[PDB]
Amino acid sequence: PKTGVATSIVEKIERAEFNTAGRKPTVLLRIADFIAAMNGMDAKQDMQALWDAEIAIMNGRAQTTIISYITKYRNAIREAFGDDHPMLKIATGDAAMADEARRVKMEKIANKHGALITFENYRQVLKICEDCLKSSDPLMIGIGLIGMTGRRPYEVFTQAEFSPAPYGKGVSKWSILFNGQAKTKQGEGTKFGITYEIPVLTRSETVLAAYKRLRESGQGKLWHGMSIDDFSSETRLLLRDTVFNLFEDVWPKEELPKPYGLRHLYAEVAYHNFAPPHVTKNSYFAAILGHNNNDLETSLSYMTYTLPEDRDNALARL
Amino acid sequence: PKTGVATSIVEKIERAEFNTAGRKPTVLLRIADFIAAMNGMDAKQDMQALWDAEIAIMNGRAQTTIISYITKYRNAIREAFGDDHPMLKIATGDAAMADEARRVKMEKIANKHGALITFENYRQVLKICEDCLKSSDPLMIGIGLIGMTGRRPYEVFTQAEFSPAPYGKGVSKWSILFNGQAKTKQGEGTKFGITYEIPVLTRSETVLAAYKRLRESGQGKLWHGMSIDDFSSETRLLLRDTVFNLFEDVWPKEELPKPYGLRHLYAEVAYHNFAPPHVTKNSYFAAILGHNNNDLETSLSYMTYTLPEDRDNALARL
DNA sequence: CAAAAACAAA
DNA sequence: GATAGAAG
DNA sequence: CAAAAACAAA
DNA sequence: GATAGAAG
């Protein structure tokens, strides 16, 4: 069509109107305005004018940033005007800048694989996680699960289901059943909707109980179901402060201690203790991380560290 | 321009005219004809007609095949009419079929990583290679180098340079300096033209001498410099028969023994004996195989087998 | 007199 | 086809 | 009476 | 941007 409103954005601008403090929502503003402007636009060249002006405002911002912004625009257009709107053929970044973006990523990752960080104090890190599994503070439990199960924060906190995994005619003690994969949309070969088994790094018993507590806390019951902008607003800076605090003294010198660090390490340790002999590391990761079928490319991003044992062994060839 | 001839094709058709035997060069024929037809064509829509007819002849052939054929066409056009000819915007496969081709590859490789083949008798395989390093028959030596150094056949046989590698203030005994990477064209981040160090699987001494012999044999001196269609014609079926013969009794049951098998295994063993602790397997491969800078995607294709030791270890976690 | 959305990076 | 860590 | 380019698959 | 294992 030629009309409709981006409800979600508007909502956010409206709340923003009466906050005790905070910087101005100028970008949600540009988007809202843009969407208004589009109403009763039939002509491509006009739509092009509107987009091109938007692009030009964004000059100065970082490439990675610009690209993210373009997504906010696109979801807004899609929300307001549906999927079929010709503005979605226009509102995109140019191809050259995408091409460079790719290059940049390849370079980064290629550099990590050539310079893995030795996770000297890793066992300490996992103990700490295990211990947080026993904390009264739901946040702490959460951190504990990210360390122990490898689920992303958003997963742990707002939407993960954890079943006990059947191990023959009993119960698996080194893995649980997980559901609520994020970053995934329905489709052949996709973990969306799918329950599946992932190794964990301490008694399935423990883990499962801890998730029960978290699920039942006040803050937990709040978290449960939150969209991502919600969850980020509620919890991101807190969780980042906590994790920084908590692991600061044991994290490899090379980098600062961040929540996703747990998922990276988790993959590494799980592989190291549990990987069967006939699958590759890339495969094992893409498996335990809930990656799409045949997606082996994404594993490459989690190859971050090396365990001091593995490092010691390489050196054992002198 | 609007004129020129594909010299190489013509040459091949001409030789073909008086062979004692062999099937008819009908495809080089279609290409030659096509190139003739293009002479004095200025109009896109005509060029489109010519291509579309070519495409339609190719129906029935396999996708992988068709795509290869399209390359022969394109190199022919490029040879005859240069790089700038608008027919190169037309002579290509459709995008849907490429997209599927990609899918197909991803699926294949994703399947190998989930079902690695245990190379039970691998040490036998490498011994055999070592022993061929001592054969009087240059072919045999060649096989020996593919097993021992990981260079592709075309590399070993026609254009590889092997220096001794400096190891501190002496000489490296577990690696040599290599040059003549094939499948590579000049460019930032490319091993073309580049000498570089690759591990080998037996005394650098041995290897280097053996390559000297091969280089100095009659057949060697012939091989040296051959284009790829030459080399294939001269040597491919022979080398495939030999390798089939030679390794038939020790190759994993799962697959037949083929020359590239050596390069796959080579990567695996080199990693297993020589990989430093701070680099990933993907990285190590892309390194020792002469892959482009930041190319980590191509390593994924060489992850084919698993060593019975590594397999035994995985199982050691019961 | 010193806490609570933009900008950016698998 | 481009998505989902500076206002008492 | 039985060896010497098409077709295809990193 | 698409390249490089059935004629004595």
Numbering used by the authors:
A (entry chain A), B (entry chain A): 104 to 421
What does the published report state?
Hairpin telomeres of bacterial linear chromosomes are generated by a DNA cutting–rejoining enzyme protelomerase. Protelomerase resolves a concatenated dimer of chromosomes as the last step of chromosome replication, converting a palindromic DNA sequence at the junctions between chromosomes into covalently closed hairpins. The protelomerase enzymes function as a dimer, making staggered cleavages of both strands of DNA to form covalent 3′-phosphotyrosine linkages, then exchanging the released 5′-ends while holding onto the 3′-ends, and finally sealing the broken DNA strands to generate two hairpin ends.
In this open conformation, the first base into the overhang region to be refolded (Ade6) completely swings out into an extrahelical position and stacks against the Tyr201 sidechain. Point mutants TelA•Y201A and TelA•R205A are capable of cleaving DNA to form the phosphotyrosine complex, but they are completely inactive in producing hairpin products in vitro. This underscores the important roles of Tyr201 and Arg205 in refolding DNA into a hairpin telomere. Consistent with the critical role of Tyr201 in orienting the tri-nucleotide stretch Ade6, Gua5, and Thy4, a crystal structure of TelA•Y201A-DNA complex shows that Ade6 has swung out further toward the protein to partially occupy the space taken by Tyr201 in the wild-type enzyme, leaving other bases in the 5′-overhang flexible.
